[PDB]
From Swiss-Prot:
Compartments, record wording: Nucleus; Chromosome
Span covered, complete protein: 555 to 674 of 1058
Main function: Scaffold subunit of various histone acetyltransferase (HAT) complexes, such as the MOZ/MORF and HBO1 complexes, that acts as a regulator of hematopoiesis. Plays a key role in HBO1 complex by directing KAT7/HBO1 specificity towards histone H3 'Lys-14' acetylation (H3K14ac), thereby promoting erythroid differentiation.
Residue location of crosslink Glycyl lysine isopeptide (Lys-Gly) (interchain with G-Cter in SUMO2): K41
Domain Bromo: 9-113
Protein name, per record: Bromodomain-containing protein 1
Domain of life: Eukaryota
Summary of subunit composition and partner proteins: Component of some HBO1 complex composed of KAT7/HBO1, MEAF6, ING4 and BRD1/BRPF2. Component of the MOZ/MORF complex composed at least of ING5, KAT6A, KAT6B, MEAF6 and one of BRPF1, BRD1/BRPF2 and BRPF3. Interacts (via PHD-type zinc finger domain) with unmodified histone H3. Interacts (via PWWP domain) with dimethylated and trimethylated 'Lys-79' on histone H3.
Length: 121
């Protein structure tokens, strides 16, 4: 149907906008602390602590499969990256501190992404 095509075009355009959002959030992580999944070889207990691991490469796979239907879904995954790190790592660590800085900086980006998603529809 033409209606199905129109919905697919909307999803594609959202995907474009989330790609640009993702690039901008990842730039706020120049150390690349959040770039890849935590290694279970190197942190064998990780899944005892963290139930839903998340990282930028995993978000990028989901994104390229057009797997985010709305901005809320994408934000959930971004929040997991931050929130997982802030639980596993102590306040005095470079990891936790990097998460705090990503959250704070990412906030700015997400604020305008929400307006753009609403605005363009």
């Amino acid at each position: 149907s033409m209606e199905q095509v129109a919905m697919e075009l909307r999803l594609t355009e959202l995907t474009r906008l989330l790609r640009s959002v993702l690039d901008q959030l990842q730039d706020k992580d120049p150390a690349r602390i959040f770039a890849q999944p935590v290694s279970l070889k190197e942190v064998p207990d990780y899944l005892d602590h963290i139930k839903h691991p998340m990282d930028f490469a995993t978000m990028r796979k989901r994104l390229e499969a057009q797997g985010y239907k709305n901005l809320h879904e994408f934000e959930e995954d971004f929040d997991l990256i931050i929130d997982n790190c802030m639980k596993y790592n102590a306040r005095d660590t470079v990891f936790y501190r990097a998460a705090v800085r990503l959250r704070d900086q990412g906030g700015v980006v997400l604020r305008q992404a929400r307006r753009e998603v609403d605005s363009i529809g």
